[PDB]
């Protein structure tokens, strides 16, 4: 294993504030099997995404589907079975913030994990139970596949 | 290994403490100590020798306080508050649920606590801290059946309904003047929940059908529904279902669509215009939703006009219909429709619309008589009021030797209902800060605004403006502006006066000794108005 999170989302807004970049769009997406809000910057030029599209999303610690660590270095000659073959859009980033609604006396019920894939920002808000796999300054892979 | 030895050590540790004789687990602990292999004689020393009668000490202190002239009741409140705080920080809701489980009706001590108000307050605070406790829930139920936080106030109906009744009676008793200070404590709880909001609006619709001032209730619905609107809520469809909107399906469709939008669109105006131009209109009361009319005012009079001159007559026709067309009703039967003044109202609205959208206007001096005659229509007047608000409120408006405030003089001359509106604008302009304006110029500007306030005061709106003057005095603005204001007020007033008018005007008339109408007013009010 090594899958920190998995769900299926649907897009409710492609860019609510008007596009600020001609290749990157800020998808706002909702999850139906839970209550998770997603904001995600997607390079629409190579992976066009339309409004109301459905997709499986998977946030993983590694790609080799064995738990073996990734080393964080580009190895195009890698021969190991990768999860990326099961998906269409694979980004690689680093979680840099985990907000919560915790008080000074209680634990957070709602958590908000922020990931930066080379600059392309993602927020994932939702119940804390689904976001315990996240931990700031840990490398992570966002895998994505549109569903019919 | 046997735990009897460790239990013996614990029993010795507990018995040796001061005044442990009074603990009620003493029976069980003595049993533990004697069965395990202790003695029933050492505990006599561990309790009696370590007993110092600290309770009787407190009795001596309390009676000494009473003998010092200190009233007992404050000390009783103090010790009761101490017990309250100790129980609050030692609270355990599972224990309370256990007192529920041993008998559904709690043992009779809690009824005695109900009989005393301080413990009712304790149980309120406990339920506020922890809503999940069935003992606390039954208890607040019993108290209300015999300052509940808004979560706890809505958590139970019988609580909420009784609280809504008390608060609504408070609103009606405090009237149009306490309305501002009794609204938010009421609207916050009504707008706290779709269920709470729907319930309160339903009771409000039920009560407002009464004709002996049910309108007094219906505005409180309008206050609370606009409170929901500014809190970002779906207050439209509930309002549509609360009227006769279902009888006209496309009407409720279009109206809900545009209210959810928060703005108009010519498609919906096309449907409503054709609906109303036809001789089968829905009731004019149906479309007189004040939020919708604010949509009209924010669209037809904003700087621009971002309006189509072809659709213009449709918007104006609907506005003049909603304001002017008078429907007669006889026992929930529409008798007649009076389209008399819709012509002239639409004409004047079109005129004033042309002028506020011209913006080239320097001809405003020419259109003044026309503007005054059009302002005689109240709806036209407050349309001009919102236009003047947006115009003057912009930065860098003041590069003229002014005219837009003379409009406000007319506005308050004709319609007393718009008196609260004009004041609310002027105070905002009175408190806005200007950078490009010289300091003396800002002083003369605020003098002109005070002239507008004085003209408003001449129309019988004396109490709120003088209250605001006293506020900004005691809370800021220079004493010269206040002195100039009271000079202008003393210029035109004449005797006699009213007690409230001197209750507000006189206490601001001692912080300054600078100037005879002043000494004449003093001589009058001192003798007549103590």
């Amino acid at each position: 294993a090594g899958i920190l999170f998995e769900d299926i989302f649907d897009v409710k807004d492609i860019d609510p504030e008007g596009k600020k970049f001609d290749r990157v769009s800020r998808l706002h997406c909702e999850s139906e099997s839970f209550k998770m809000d997603l904001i995600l910057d997607v390079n629409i030029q190579i992976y066009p995404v339309d409004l109301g599209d459905k997709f499986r999303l998977v946030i993983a610690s590694t790609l080799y589907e064995d738990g073996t660590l990734d080393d964080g270095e580009y190895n195009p000659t890698d021969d190991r079975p990768s999860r990326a073959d099961q998906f269409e859009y694979v980004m690689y980033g680093k979680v840099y913030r985990i907000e919560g609604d915790e008080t000074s006396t209680e634990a957070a019920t709602r958590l908000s994990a922020y990931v930066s894939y080379g600059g392309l920002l993602m927020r994932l808000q939702g119940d804390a139970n689904n976001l315990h796999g996240f931990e700031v300054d840990s490398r992570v892979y966002l895998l994505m596949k549109k569903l019919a | 290994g046997e735990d009897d030895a460790e239990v013996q050590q614990e029993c010795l540790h507990k018995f040796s403490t001061r005044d442990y004789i009074m603990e009620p687990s003493i029976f069980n602990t003595l049993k533990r100590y004697f069965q395990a292999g202790g003695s029933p004689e050492n505990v006599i020393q561990l309790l009696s020798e370590n007993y110092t009668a600290v309770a009787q000490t407190v009795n001596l202190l309390a009676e000494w306080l009473i003998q010092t002239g200190v009233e007992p009741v404050q000390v009783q409140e103090t010790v009761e508050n101490h017990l309250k705080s100790l129980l609050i920080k030692h609270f355990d809701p599972r224990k309370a649920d256990s007192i529920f489980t041993e008998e559904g009706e709690t043992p009779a001590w809690l009824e005695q606590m109900i009989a005393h108000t301080t413990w009712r307050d304790l149980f309120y605070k406990l339920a506020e801290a922890h809503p999940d406790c069935l003992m606390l829930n039954f208890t607040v139920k019993l108290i209300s059946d015999a300052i509940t936080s808004v979560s706890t106030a809505c958590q139970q109906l019988e609580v909420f309904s009784r609280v809504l009744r008390t608060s609504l009676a408070t609103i009606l008793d405090g009237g149009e003047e306490n309305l501002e200070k009794n609204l938010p404590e009421f609207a916050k709880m009504v707008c706290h929940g779709e269920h709470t909001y729907l319930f309160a609006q339903a009771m409000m619709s039920v009560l407002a059908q009464e004709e002996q001032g049910g309108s007094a209730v219906r505005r409180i619905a309008q206050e609370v529904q606009r409170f929901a609107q500014e809190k970002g809520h779906d207050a439209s469809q509930i309002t549509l279902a609360l009227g006769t909107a279902a009888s006209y399906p496309r009407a409720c469709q279009a109206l809900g669509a545009m209210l959810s939008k928060g703005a108009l669109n010519p498609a919906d105006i096309t449907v409503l215009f054709k609906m109303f131009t036809s001789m089968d209109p829905p009731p004019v009361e149906l479309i007189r939703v004040p939020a919708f009319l604010d949509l009209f005012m924010q669209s037809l009079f904003k700087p621009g006009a971002r309006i189509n001159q072809d659709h213009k007559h449709k918007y104006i026709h609907i506005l003049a219909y909603a304001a002017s067309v008078v429907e007669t009703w006889k026992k929930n039967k529409r008798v007649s429709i009076n389209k008399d003044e819709l012509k002239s109202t639409s004409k004047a609205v079109e005129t004033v619309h042309n002028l506020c959208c011209n913006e080239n206007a320097s001809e405003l001096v020419a259109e003044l008589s026309t503007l005054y005659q059009c302002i005689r229509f109240p709806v036209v007047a407050m349309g001009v009021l919102k236009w003047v608000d947006w115009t003057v409120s912009e930065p860098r408006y003041f590069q003229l030797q002014p005219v837009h405030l003379a409009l406000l003089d007319e506005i308050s001359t004709c319609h007393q209902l718009l008196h609260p509106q004009v004041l609310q604008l002027l105070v905002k302009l009175f408190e806005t800060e200007h950078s490009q304006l010289d300091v003396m110029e800002q002083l003369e500007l605020k003098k002109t605004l005070l002239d507008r306030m004085v003209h408003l005061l001449s129309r019988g709106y004396v109490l709120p403006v003088v209250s605001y003057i006293r506020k900004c005095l005691e809370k800021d603005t220079d004493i010269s502006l206040i002195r100039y204001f009271v000079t202008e007020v003393l210029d035109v007033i004449a005797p006699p006066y009213t007690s409230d008018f001197v209750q507000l005007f006189l206490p601001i008339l001692e912080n300054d000794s600078i100037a005879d109408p002043v000494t004449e007013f003093i001589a009058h009010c001192k003798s007549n108005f103590i």
């Binding site: 919560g100 915790e102 000074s104 006396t105 209680e106 931990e135 700031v136 300054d137 | -």
Partner: protein
């Protein structure tokens, strides 16, 4: 109010200490009143410092020029040692003082 709330260490709410500190440290803080005396003395001297700054800076300008950028060094310490701010910390307050 804000100064006391944000700067006075509170040792009278066990829940916050469990949230922020490891269990043995919380028991140590709650147990001995000597550490409590040291912490309240720290807050008292910081209030004295506050009054001194009010004398020095009557205009209330917090912007000042100083040798060591304390917030940035704290951030550097957080990242060097991978300090997870979601977990209770093992740093004794008396060690800080």
């Amino acid at each position: 109010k804000a100064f006391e709330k944000k700067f006075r260490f509170d040792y009278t709410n066990e829940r916050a200490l469990r949230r922020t500190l490891q269990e043995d440290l919380v028991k140590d803080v709650l147990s001995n009143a000597h550490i409590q005396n040291e912490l309240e003395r720290e807050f008292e001297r910081m209030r004295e410092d506050r009054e001194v700054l009010r004398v020095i800076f009557p205009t209330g300008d917090s912007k000042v020029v100083l040798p060591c950028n304390l917030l940035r060094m704290i951030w550097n310490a957080q990242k060097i040692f991978h300090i997870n701010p979601r977990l209770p910390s093992d740093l004794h307050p008396i060690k800080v003082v």
